[PDB]
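Internal QA ticket QA-208
Title: Verify multi-chain structure generation after dependency bump
Assignee: T.L.

Test input:
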Amino acid sequence: MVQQKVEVRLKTGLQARPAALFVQEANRFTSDVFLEKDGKKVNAKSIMGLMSLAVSTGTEVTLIAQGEDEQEALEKLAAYVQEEV
Amino acid sequence: MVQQKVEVRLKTGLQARPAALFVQEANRFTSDVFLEKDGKKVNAKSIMGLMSLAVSTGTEVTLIAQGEDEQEALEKLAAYVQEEV
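Actual output:
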């Protein structure tokens, strides 16, 4: 019989489900999505593109949308990425 | 054409793959696994048990193993949960 306390350190990030919705909102777009962070860059709104890299608490991402349908960018992606209540 | 910077806030935690390995290591056990955190408690090493709740950076978990095969608890789970290099 034994018992000792420990700490957590496992990986941390956005599962594969959230990333699926990320593109869904853009699905109603018509411009172009581009996420730039830590000098790194991904194809755009690709699912595997994000799931490939990783982020942390406090981090940030540069969302760029050029066009008219860019609405979903500021409208949805902004409110969504902000988990507004 | 538009373009504005933003910040990340999406959810954060251990995907469903890591949790699958958590039990794998215990699969070679024979005692009992119990994780207690934030007064909360899960069946034990259940996959859906953890995926159900959530954790954060700096957080901790109380791993309890009572028995002889408790080796995997201190041996593997400790080194694993510590992501030792």
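Spot checks passed. The radius of gyration of chain B is 16 Å.
Status: verified.
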